[PDB]
């Protein structure tokens, strides 16, 4: 049954998410969309950082550990948070108006291939099929970020203790608040989605390394994108 502490965490994560997710950039136009979507991702990294800072216990981590968690989770959290604006009606990210509505055609014009885009879209469909509560969605984003198995973490035990608190809150939430049979193996399906994001992260990194090796494309990126994803 959900403790005071557990309800507190959920309340904090929902508010952090509402404050940092809104359903200025170079305008949308094989690379025609790279400037706009580099800007969109660069901006979305700032939102991820805004959310991460409000995760209970995140602030207790060293600056270095905060940096390695954010560097390694940022693209995964961007893909994961986008799910709320994703519409199975026409497999698009429909951010209000048609200018800022993104289908397979649009997101494939930024020098990334269907090797990334097709799994990304299947991931969004698979996540919609789970029909998560916003409570489960914000817990999954927090567990995604505060992960003790990211390369470069110094205090794995502290990150593990924070993640376990978040994991325990999530499992408790599912048992008390998620309607069976929708609750059945829901925790395990959500962890599987975190695994699908690690694989999407790896494919993004491979493709980013090639794209960003081409200086004519690097030129279209942003300083934050270069610092987070690399040179």
């Amino acid at each position: 049954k959900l403790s005071e502490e557990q309800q507190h965490i959920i309340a904090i994560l929902l508010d952090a998410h509402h404050k940092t997710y809104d359903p200025d950039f170079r305008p949308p136009v094989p690379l025609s969309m790279l400037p706009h979507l580099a800007d969109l991702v660069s901006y979305s990294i700032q939102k991820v950082i805004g959310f991460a800072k409000m995760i209970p216990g995140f602030r207790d981590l060293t600056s270095d550990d905060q940096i390695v968690l954010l560097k390694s989770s940022a693209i995964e959290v961007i893909m994961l948070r986008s799910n709320q604006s994703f519409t199975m009606d026409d497999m698009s990210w429909d951010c209000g108006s048609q200018d800022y509505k993104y289908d397979v055609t649009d997101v494939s014009k930024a020098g990334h291939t269907l090797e990334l885009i097709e799994p990304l879209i299947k991931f969004q469909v698979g996540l919609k099929k789970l029909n998560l509560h916003e409570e489960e969605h914000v817990l999954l984003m927090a567990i995604c970020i505060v992960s003790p198995d990211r390369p470069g973490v110094q205090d794995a035990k502290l990150v593990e203790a924070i993640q376990d608190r978040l994991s325990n809150t999530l499992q408790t939430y599912i048992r008390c608040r998620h309607p069976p049979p929708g609750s059945h193996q829901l925790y395990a399906k959500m962890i599987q989605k975190l695994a699908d994001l690690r694989s999407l992260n790896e494919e993004h990194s491979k493709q980013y390394r090639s794209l960003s090796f081409q200086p004519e494309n690097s030129m279209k990126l942003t300083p934050l994108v270069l610092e987070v994803f690399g040179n």
């Binding site: 700032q46 950082i49 800072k53 600056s63 905060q66 940096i67 954010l70 560097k71 300083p223 934050l224 610092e227 987070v228």
Partner: peptide
């Protein structure tokens, strides 16, 4: 080596 990330954290 991460000044902009560091700034956004603080």
């Amino acid at each position: 080596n991460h000044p902009m990330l560091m700034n956004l954290l603080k």
